[PDB]
Structure formats: structure tokens, C-alpha cells
């Protein structure tokens, strides 16, 4: 809804909340210089 | 979406779907902000080149799906809309300035495994993120070709291309509320958002906090995946002080 | 192409 979203936003049931990645989100991470 | 994949079931609880009530047909992409509110692009609604200006009544909000055509019985959820808000300076007689709209449910909806909203920038996590070379993803039901249409959800993962670069491969005056992504023809790499997918998300993932965050809307382009010709989109951070204007004006 | 939705969304 607002500022940086809403509470729980921008992390979904089935990949996030249960630690799963989608196939490709790696790519964007990746990008970002490298994430973690 | 052109050369984008067929997305996960799951992968963006947030996309929503303009549907038009008679005849029935797919109009736009969007996203899910609240339980109450849907982001689309402005154009989708008023467009009076081709006398296009929709109301309240005419459309219908289908929330949780993945297949474009089914009506997936359990799993969607379609709501009706009691306001609709246009920029007041949206620009459609030039460039499509300001092409931002909300969308206020008639019902709050309830989240489930499908259906979960996406976070709106601050201005910390647009500063970092929306750098030239980081990629972001699109996603929508649109054609798949420029003249070829999937029978599932879409996805294509794009980078954000520096603004002289935007300037430069258009006719069309840019402004700061738009930014554009897309691979160089020199790449070798394609993708690209076409009819169809205009209202919908432009995502990217913080990997400070793991969320996923909307940063643009799909607003123009010229022709699908041309060599040399780039996607552009409303910058949504720069519009975020109208939105939470209209939201705790009219809602939450 | 579109499936048919149910009556009470219209
Ligand atoms: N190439 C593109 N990114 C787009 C092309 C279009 C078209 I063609 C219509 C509506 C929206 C869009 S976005
Ligand atoms: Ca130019
Ligand atoms: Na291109």
C-alpha cells in the first residue's frame, strides 16, 4: 500500500516464505553486482 | 511478452488482470498494492486518440491467475472496482507523461498462496536498484510476437539502460517520469514487453531485505523486441507521493 | 477464447 510496500509485501507463499527460489531470480541477483 | 518463458505457478502473486466486461477480453496487466488498491497504467483506461475512456463499470479485476484464457474456479478471484483515479497531468496528447492510475476494489480481497501484494519503493531501494546493467522482470499475458499469444503467464527477465541511450534510440521526448530497459542489439540476448502487457510490472528484488519491489509499469514502446528500439516505463517512485495522495485521501 | 465466467461478476 505505501512506503516500501505494505508489511508483508514483496514476499511470496511459495517461494520466499518457504526459502524456494524460481529458476531465474538468480539473473537478477546476479546482476545487482552479485547478491549475498 | 516476446522471448520471455512461461512463468511458475506462484512467481507473481501480484499480477492482476484488466478484464472488460462485453465484449470479454483481456485489456491490460496490473498489480496488487493492498488488499483494496491495483496499480495500472493510465493509458489503459483513457486513451481518446482511439476514444478509449473506460468507467467503474465496464471492467472487472481478475486477481491469482496463471492461464490466460481459463477461469481457474478456487484459485482466481475477480473483484469489481468503486473508484478510479487518473493522474491529473497524465500527458496523453504528447508523450504519455505520468501514466499512472489506481484502482480502488469494491471488496478488500483475501491473500492466499496466488494472491499477495508487491512492495512500493522508498527512496533508498530506488536509488540502489534502478542502476543501469541491473535487471528487473515483466510479466504478463500480451503477444508474443509483434505480428502469438500464450496460453500461460510470461516472463522475461530485462536491464535498465542508461537514459542518453533511451533519448537516443527515439523521436519521442522522454521526460524523468520514465525510464526504459531492454539488451542492446549488440547483446544478443531479446526480450521485451508488446500489446497486451501495458498496466503491468516492472519487479526487481532487493537483496538487502529479499522483497520484491514494483519500480515501473509497462507504458510504450515502438513495435516488440526491434533491434536497436527499448521498452519504456513509468518510473513509480517518482509518481509515489500522488499515490499515497489518493490512498489515504480515498482508502487504504 | 476466454472461458466463460460466472453470472455474479457481471
Ligand atoms: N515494445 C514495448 N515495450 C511495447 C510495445 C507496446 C505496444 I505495440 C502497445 C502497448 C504497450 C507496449 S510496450
Ligand atoms: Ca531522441
Ligand atoms: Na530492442
Redesign the interface.
Same mark, same amino acid.
Given at each position: 500500500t505505501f512506503g516500501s510496500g505494505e508489511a508483508d509485501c514483496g514476499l511470496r507463499p511459495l517461494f520466499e516464505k518457504k526459502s524456494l527460489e524460481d529458476k531465474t531470480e538468480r539473473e537478477l541477483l546476479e546482476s545487482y553486482i552479485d547478491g549475498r | 511478452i516476446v522471448e520471455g518463458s512461461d512463468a511458475e505457478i506462484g512467481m507473481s502473486p501480484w499480477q492482476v488482470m484488466l478484464?472488460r466486461?462485453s465484449p $470479454?477480453?483481456?485489456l491490460c496487466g496490473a498489480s496488487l498494492i493492498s488488499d483494496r488498491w491495483v496499480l495500472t497504467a493510465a493509458h489503459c483506461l483513457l486513451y481518446p486518440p482511439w476514444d478509449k475512456n473506460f468507467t467503474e463499470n465496464d471492467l472487472?479485476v481478475?486477481i491469482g491467475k496463471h492461464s490466460r484464457?481459463?477461469?481457474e474456479r478456487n484459485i482466481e478471484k475477480?473483484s469489481?472496482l468503486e473508484k478510479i483515479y487518473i493522474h491529473p497531468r497524465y500527458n496523453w496528447r504528447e508523450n504519455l507523461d505520468r501514466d499512472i492510475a489506481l484502482m480502488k476494489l469494491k471488496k478488500p480481497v483475501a491473500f492466499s498462496d496466488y494472491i499477495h501484494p508487491v512492495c512500493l519503493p522508498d527512496r533508498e531501494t530506488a536509488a540502489s536498484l534502478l542502476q543501469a546493467g541491473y535487471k528487473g522482470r515483466v510479466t504478463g499475458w500480451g503477444n508474443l510476437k509483434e505480428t502469438g $499469444?500464450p496460453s500461460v503467464l510470461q516472463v522475461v527477465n530485462l536491464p535498465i539502460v542508461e537514459r542518453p541511450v533511451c533519448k537516443d534510440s527515439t523521436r519521442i521526448r522522454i521526460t524523468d517520469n520514465m525510464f526504459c530497459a531492454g539488451y542492446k542489439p549488440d547483446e544478443g540476448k531479446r526480450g521485451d514487453a508488446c500489446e497486451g502487457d501495458s498496466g503491468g510490472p516492472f519487479v526487481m528484488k532487493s537483496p538487502f531485505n529479499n522483497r520484491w519491489y514494483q519500480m515501473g509499469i509497462v507504458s510504450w514502446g515502438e513495435g516488440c523486441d526491434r533491434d536497436g528500439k527499448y521498452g519504456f516505463y513509468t518510473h513509480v517512485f517518482r509518481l509515489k507521493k500522488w499515490i499515497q495522495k489518493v490512498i489515504d485521501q480515498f482508502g487504504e | 477464447?476466454?472461458?466463460?465466467?460466472?453470472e455474479e461478476?457481471?
Amino acid at each position: 500500500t505505501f512506503g516500501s510496500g505494505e508489511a508483508d509485501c514483496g514476499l511470496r507463499p511459495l517461494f520466499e516464505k518457504k526459502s524456494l527460489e524460481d529458476k531465474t531470480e538468480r539473473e537478477l541477483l546476479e546482476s545487482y553486482i552479485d547478491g549475498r | 511478452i516476446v522471448e520471455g518463458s512461461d512463468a511458475e505457478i506462484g512467481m507473481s502473486p501480484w499480477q492482476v488482470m484488466l478484464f472488460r466486461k462485453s465484449p $470479454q477480453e483481456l485489456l491490460c496487466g496490473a498489480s496488487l498494492i493492498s488488499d483494496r488498491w491495483v496499480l495500472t497504467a493510465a493509458h489503459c483506461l483513457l486513451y481518446p486518440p482511439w476514444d478509449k475512456n473506460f468507467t467503474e463499470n465496464d471492467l472487472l479485476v481478475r486477481i491469482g491467475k496463471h492461464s490466460r484464457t481459463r477461469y481457474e474456479r478456487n484459485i482466481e478471484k475477480i473483484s469489481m472496482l468503486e473508484k478510479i483515479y487518473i493522474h491529473p497531468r497524465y500527458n496523453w496528447r504528447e508523450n504519455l507523461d505520468r501514466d499512472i492510475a489506481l484502482m480502488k476494489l469494491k471488496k478488500p480481497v483475501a491473500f492466499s498462496d496466488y494472491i499477495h501484494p508487491v512492495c512500493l519503493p522508498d527512496r533508498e531501494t530506488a536509488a540502489s536498484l534502478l542502476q543501469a546493467g541491473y535487471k528487473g522482470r515483466v510479466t504478463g499475458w500480451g503477444n508474443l510476437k509483434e505480428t502469438g $499469444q500464450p496460453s500461460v503467464l510470461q516472463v522475461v527477465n530485462l536491464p535498465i539502460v542508461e537514459r542518453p541511450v533511451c533519448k537516443d534510440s527515439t523521436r519521442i521526448r522522454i521526460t524523468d517520469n520514465m525510464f526504459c530497459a531492454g539488451y542492446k542489439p549488440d547483446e544478443g540476448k531479446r526480450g521485451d514487453a508488446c500489446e497486451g502487457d501495458s498496466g503491468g510490472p516492472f519487479v526487481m528484488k532487493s537483496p538487502f531485505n529479499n522483497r520484491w519491489y514494483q519500480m515501473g509499469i509497462v507504458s510504450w514502446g515502438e513495435g516488440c523486441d526491434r533491434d536497436g528500439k527499448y521498452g519504456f516505463y513509468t518510473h513509480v517512485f517518482r509518481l509515489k507521493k500522488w499515490i499515497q495522495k489518493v490512498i489515504d485521501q480515498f482508502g487504504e | 477464447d476466454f472461458e466463460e465466467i460466472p453470472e455474479e461478476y457481471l
